[PDB]
Amino acid sequence: ELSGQPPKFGGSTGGLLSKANREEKYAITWTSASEQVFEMPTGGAAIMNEGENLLYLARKEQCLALGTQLRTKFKPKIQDYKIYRVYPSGEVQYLHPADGVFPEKVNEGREAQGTKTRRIGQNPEPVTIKFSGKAPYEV
Amino acid sequence: SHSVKIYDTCIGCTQCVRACPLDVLEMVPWDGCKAAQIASSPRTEDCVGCKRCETACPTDFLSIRVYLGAETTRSMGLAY
Amino acid sequence: LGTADFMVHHIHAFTIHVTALILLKGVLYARSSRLVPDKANLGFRFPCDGPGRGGTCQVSGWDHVFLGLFWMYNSLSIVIFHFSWKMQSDVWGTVSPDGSVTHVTLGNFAQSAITINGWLRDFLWAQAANVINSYGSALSAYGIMFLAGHFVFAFSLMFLFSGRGYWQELIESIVWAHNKLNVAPAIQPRALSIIQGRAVGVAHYLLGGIVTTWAFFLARSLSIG
Amino acid sequence: PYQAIDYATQLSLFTHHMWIGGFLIVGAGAHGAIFMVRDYDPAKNVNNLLDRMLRHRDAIISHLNWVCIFLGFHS
Amino acid sequence: TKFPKFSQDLAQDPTTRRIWYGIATAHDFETHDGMTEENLYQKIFASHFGHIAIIFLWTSGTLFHVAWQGNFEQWIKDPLNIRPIAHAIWDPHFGEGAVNAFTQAGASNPVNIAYSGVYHWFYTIGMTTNQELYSGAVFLLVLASLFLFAGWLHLQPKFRPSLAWFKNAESRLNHHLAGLFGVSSLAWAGHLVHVAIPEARGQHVGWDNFLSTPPHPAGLMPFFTGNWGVYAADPDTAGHIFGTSEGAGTAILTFLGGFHPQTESLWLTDIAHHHLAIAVIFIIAGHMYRTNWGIGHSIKEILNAHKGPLTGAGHTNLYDTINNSLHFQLGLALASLGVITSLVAQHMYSLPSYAFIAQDHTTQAALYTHHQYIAGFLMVGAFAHGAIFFVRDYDPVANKDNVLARMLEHKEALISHLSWVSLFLGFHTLGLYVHNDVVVAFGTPEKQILIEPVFAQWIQATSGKALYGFDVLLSNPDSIASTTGAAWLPGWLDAINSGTNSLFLTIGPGDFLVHHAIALGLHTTALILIKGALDARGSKLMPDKKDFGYSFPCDGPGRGGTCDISAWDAFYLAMFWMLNTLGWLTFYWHWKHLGVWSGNVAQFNENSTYLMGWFRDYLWANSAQLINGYNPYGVNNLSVWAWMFLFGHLVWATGFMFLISWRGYWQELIETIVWAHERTPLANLVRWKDKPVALSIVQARLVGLAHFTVGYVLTYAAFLIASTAGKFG
Amino acid sequence: DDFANLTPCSENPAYLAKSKNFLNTTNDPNSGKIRAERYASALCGPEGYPHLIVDGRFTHAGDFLIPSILFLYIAGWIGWVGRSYLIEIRESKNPEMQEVVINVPLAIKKMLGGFLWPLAAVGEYTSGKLVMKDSEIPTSPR
């Protein structure tokens, strides 16, 4: 399961809401080499524990913003952070990184998705597919 | 959710992937450009439609487009 | 001070608290927010974050300042209007040798300033006679300026109500026109940026409104003895 | 001397300096946000007054919004 | 969630936006889930039935309320001294002063005063008693019921029309020209001859005795034997008194021309011959297109035959384009209807048809303003739905090289030259106005640039006006055109030369300036609409706009920023220019007619050449009574108009909040409010079913434009009605 | 016998009554009198102000024609010198820099040559380099 000590924080009013306990939340875990201070994506600053740190957030964008801050705002670069999605039923779904390799670099084994084999100027006219349930890009 | 489509004018500059804040895009090997890599959108269910990927694309017009469709909680970026 | 003074002072309180709300929200949420968690990385002056998340127009601190300028204008306009009318109605005037005091507007503030129609009729329409009838005299330079104030304000609405895509397309067509005659400029013309469009709109708006009020006040005060 | 007897001078001076003050206050509200975006450093502002500004700001804005709405209505 | 059932994308939205967009896309049958063409056409047919029934119910309600709480029988005894009554007032929120103020027009209770000018219409068409009005209201109720049942019926499976039936242009044109237009006009002429004219000549005729009262002493004999002139002998003399037998003639079809000496309106017999002649012409026109007997033209061959060496393919394949695209037809119909509505206003303020309606100035002004605003709205809608057609139903390959596709070939030239003409008008018109204002303000009003409207005065002379002394065509008695023995000339020349009517009003430099300003406004609004319609397909900034639909927010801040880039946004921008142009038009009309009615044409003539005169002599001057509707000293009958004036001045300003402030600010504020609600005790027991979100960008633009337009219309209507009622009413 | 609704200002009672009180525009005290005598030639309405007629007749050519040629010559001068300067700049390896920092020698040299703009314009139109071909101009997608 998820393991980690929460960072030393005084709390804030910009944290979680009823959505986390009703719909879903997100978690981020990372090993800090040394204790230091980082900016909470919800506002304020928090001291993160040395070793493994675990943090709960409300949106995936907030978790990824925190991950970018960790990767770019500390001289010892934090590269091991993992972002999971936490369901109210207790199931934990691992989100980022998808395969242990950052998406910014090409890794063998990934499958191309959403890729079209034509230029954007070769899309069909709407009048040829009207009264269908599709869109020019979808066909 | 929104639809992110990538066309064959991509040159594997990875700018769209880096500009994505919600980690929707990725890089997959290709053979149509010098970089031998093309962008991919395997996690479009998390996309919000901020168009940063379109803003970062260097090719003429865009090799990547975002069409805003059905709005979900994730797409609308709601924290409540 | 009567009922009207109470109402106007609390109106001032409302306007000031609203302007404070706008500016304080701009300062507090400048770094980030629930909608945008990394706003500070975009900078202080950025137009938007895109149509994602339902639409993220005017989330920067600069846009909060741009919105607070209008509310400051409204609050200060109400303040100066209250001062002018109250001074004319219950303070200024003339003193007869008998000792009686005849005020400029015969003390109509206490009975008219309790309705919006009172402000429209007994203050704006009533006291605008001295500026609209200024033509042919030394005060005509005010009347002209008065109309000038009513113009730029309207002009500003053509920047605040519209967006830059339409103007960019129109500039594309006009560039085609100038290209047909081989007179196209080397410096490619582009429509104003979103931030610049907002700034131009608010600037011309404030200019027009303030010039209108200045001309009205000067033409009124130079004619009440 | 004679400033009160000249109604035009009174009105002009009052309105002019009032507008100047309003513009300056708006500029304060602007450049404060500029500082917050640029020169704010969370490392040196742990659990100080600024941090607790950023940590109960939502209550501030909500209560301020309520008072603004209430004043607007009941005025 | 169930609503909206026609779009599963919206139905799965957790936010309140689903409630908004569901309303917005409700009547857009094309984009509904699982929609076929046949179902689309059948649903449109039923909806059109519904709108027709609604129109009939509205007319019936007008008739019924006028009959019930009006003073129609009292008004006909003195049309020039009694105010018509619209409907009674029942407001528990009223006070004693309002009750005393609104008890007007001789009524015994608070009541309104009608300004739709329907009393004059009912008097002219023949109805004179309350029972007739009641019978008309009941009959219109029955008609609405019949049309509603028809809409239900032609929706059942055994009666749903086929798709081939809908796409039958020739039969529809034949039936709707010979039958809908010609037969209705002929029936109206028969109503005027059989009922309206005898009623106006004193002889009462109704359903009880119209079967035994011949409209003419010689019944059907001269008509069938070719001796038609019998029906034109013995017209109504100049001494005829409307509704009586004093000076009444016996002719039922005349060509008198001009106006009635007493009612200052057109002769009824002239209307009879007019509608009869146009009925004959329409019936002839309705026998043109081939349907089932071999004879008749076919639209496709006519369109494909009119080619040209300069336009390329000419009008080829246009038949399919128009028939297969409902938006093309809607745009054509809207443009035609807007032009016709403008024509109705222009030819109805100057050529009144109803008795004693030219002396009721308030109703004339209201009618002109109303129908002109309707025409402006329709003209905007035509271009909007044409842009929609270009986005959706335009097939480039089918229309290859014809006029439709060739428009997009020189669209840049269109927009360029239209921008040039708009700028050329605006620059040198505002320059002249500002020059006159500055020079007048400097105490030297004699250096004003005053240009005589030479061409318009020449046209007036050619139509017969002899004031300008041009002596051309109908103004020249020696010319052939004035020596043809036309039966209308002696009356028409008498009517136009009189200065007691609006027939070809005298003009001066101010009218020149304001007509050129109106031209500027028309060309600029057309520029916006045309540019949006042509760029809807795509442009340099967005080469693939068609893939993004007709109405989309933007393309993000990238590529330099793309705010207001959709064609919907072009329509949104053009609406403001439409409103401004209508404001200029109506201000000019109202000020000119105020001068005409009061007899003080000199005020307008002197002061309309500089903008300060417009500001002071029209706005400041005529607002004196409006704003005094309710006073610290009392309340008069204009109180409601003052209240609505302020109401419009408020809604107009409220629109600015949506037009200026944009989404992100309100979204963050709503975040804070959501947190506050969720953290408050005794309030967490209640939770929203739909997550509250800020209004979308396009929705915000639409809402701001709606508040803006409502405030604009209400403010101007209140000001116009109050000013005219106080001055003359 | 045209303009029966217009009268010469010389015998217009309103203009004559109001012309003795014309304001002096400049420091010269005779400016009012000069304006009064010069405006007596034109046509006045009942309001006493002069009017202009632009139907095309040469009797009133002073109202619109003479100023029309006067303005058109200057406008053509400005447009031609601007276009020629732009075209010459276009081949200097940095046209934009010379667009913000004006090449004053070349600018004035083109200024002094603009009085022959109609002859230059017709020569350019005949030579075919005044107007570009539609196939050589960028256009937005249809």
Ligand code: CLA
């Ligand atoms: C002592 C006063 C003071 C000082 C020193 C500064 C200093 C600064 N401000 Mg600031 N500001 C002030 C007052 C002040 N401000 C006030 C009162 C306001 C509220 C309106 C602002 C609002 C403000 C914003 C919104 C921004 C700044 C920015 C800046 C920075 C420089 C960029 C800039 O504005 O230059 C460029 C200046 C201009 C382009 C101004 C020229 C155009 C003006 C508006 C025309 C004014 C028209 C005039 C009043 C009437 C003319 C009429 C006409 C017909 C002739 C700099 C740190 C910018 C920043 O972020 O930098 C860090 C920025 O974005 N300021």
Ligand code: CLA
């Ligand atoms: C507190 C303010 C107030 C209120 C509540 C009213 C209320 C009323 N006035 Mg009134 N009035 C007021 C102030 C007020 N007045 C003032 C200050 C003046 C000036 C002195 C007047 C002058 C005045 C006159 C002259 C008349 C009235 C009339 C009326 C009545 C109209 C009946 C009605 O609304 O049904 C009809 C309801 C509507 C038309 C609804 C329109 C508004 C909605 C929002 C539009 C619908 C939008 C949308 C499609 C709704 C969807 C469906 C919905 C169920 C969700 C009503 C009792 C009239 C009357 O008594 O005759 C009946 C009348 O002739 N008033």
Ligand code: CLA
């Ligand atoms: C004689 C046969 C006949 C007649 C009378 C009609 C009549 C009508 N058809 Mg129609 N139709 C016909 C045959 C006929 N059809 C055939 C054969 C077909 C199949 C090919 C169709 C297919 C068809 C379709 C598909 C539709 C219609 C519709 C309509 C209605 C449109 C409303 C309208 O125009 O009235 C109002 C307008 C007028 C009466 C004339 C317009 C006004 C004129 C131009 C100018 C104004 C005159 C005057 C100055 C104004 C009055 C002033 C006064 C108030 C003071 C109308 C009732 C529509 C509908 O749904 O209706 C149910 C529709 O969608 N028709």
Ligand code: CLA
């Ligand atoms: C014959 C008339 C006619 C018809 C049949 C249509 C039909 C259509 N139009 Mg169209 N249109 C028309 C006239 C018409 N239009 C005119 C005159 C204009 C100019 C304003 C437009 C402008 C227009 C635009 C800009 C768009 C359409 C669209 C559409 C399509 C679907 C959306 C829609 O209309 O429903 C939905 C309609 C609404 C939700 C309107 C509700 C707004 C209400 C009526 C405002 C009421 C104000 C308020 C109540 C005032 C209160 C007053 C109180 C305070 C006293 C549909 C095919 C849309 C499209 O492209 O779809 C394909 C679209 O984007 N039309």
Ligand code: CLA
């Ligand atoms: C009074 C307000 C006002 C004014 C003057 C304009 C003026 C203009 N609009 Mg605009 N517009 C307005 C309000 C206004 N708009 C509003 C509220 C809307 C709704 C959003 C629009 C929507 C709109 C659209 C959608 C379009 C326009 C277009 C135009 C141009 C058309 C040319 C024209 O009409 O006259 C000619 C122009 C003028 C007379 C204005 C110039 C006046 C100045 C004073 C000249 C002198 C310059 C001055 C001395 C500079 C001093 C600067 C220094 C002091 C700092 C013009 C620039 C169209 C366009 O671009 O056409 C090419 C166009 O596409 N506007």
Ligand SMILES: CC1=C(/C=C/C(C)=C/C=C/C(C)=C\C=C\C=C(C)\C=C\C=C(C)\C=C\C2=C[C@H](C)[C@H](O)CC2(C)C)C(C)(C)C[C@@H](O)C1
């Ligand atoms: C040459 C030149 C250029 C280019 C110029 C170009 C390309 C011009 C192109 C022009 C075109 C294509 C068309 C022009 C049409 C002109 C028309 C239609 C003129 C109409 C004139 C009328 C209607 C005269 C009207 C009456 C004429 C009469 C004399 C009286 O008054 C009365 C009155 C006003 C009625 C620039 C722009 C590059 C630079 C300029 O400096 C010079």
Ligand SMILES: CC1=C(/C=C/C(C)=C/C=C/C(C)=C/C=C/C=C(C)/C=C/C=C(C)/C=C/C2=C(C)CCCC2(C)C)C(C)(C)CCC1
């Ligand atoms: C884009 C588009 C569209 C739209 C457009 C529009 C909307 C248009 C409009 C247009 C218009 C709106 C037009 C108008 C026209 C008019 C005219 C053209 C008129 C004419 C007239 C005349 C010619 C007259 C003459 C005369 C006189 C003057 C006097 C004597 C007698 C007579 C009759 C001879 C559509 C949908 C279609 C299609 C698609 C695309």
Ligand SMILES: CC1=C(C/C=C(\C)CCC[C@H](C)CCC[C@H](C)CCCC(C)C)C(=O)c2ccccc2C1=O
């Ligand atoms: C009209 C308009 C434009 C087009 C306007 C442009 C391109 C500005 C053109 C300015 C001209 C070139 C100069 C006028 C202003 C100068 C300051 C004048 C200086 C004068 C002295 C030299 C004497 C936009 O780009 C825009 C963008 C976003 C929202 C609204 C709008 C908008 O409304």
Ligand code: SF4
């Ligand atoms: S930014 Fe554009 S070109 Fe670069 S990798 Fe992404 S899609 Fe390809």
Ligand code: SF4
């Ligand atoms: S409308 Fe303009 S400001 Fe708003 S999201 Fe789109 S590009 Fe950004």
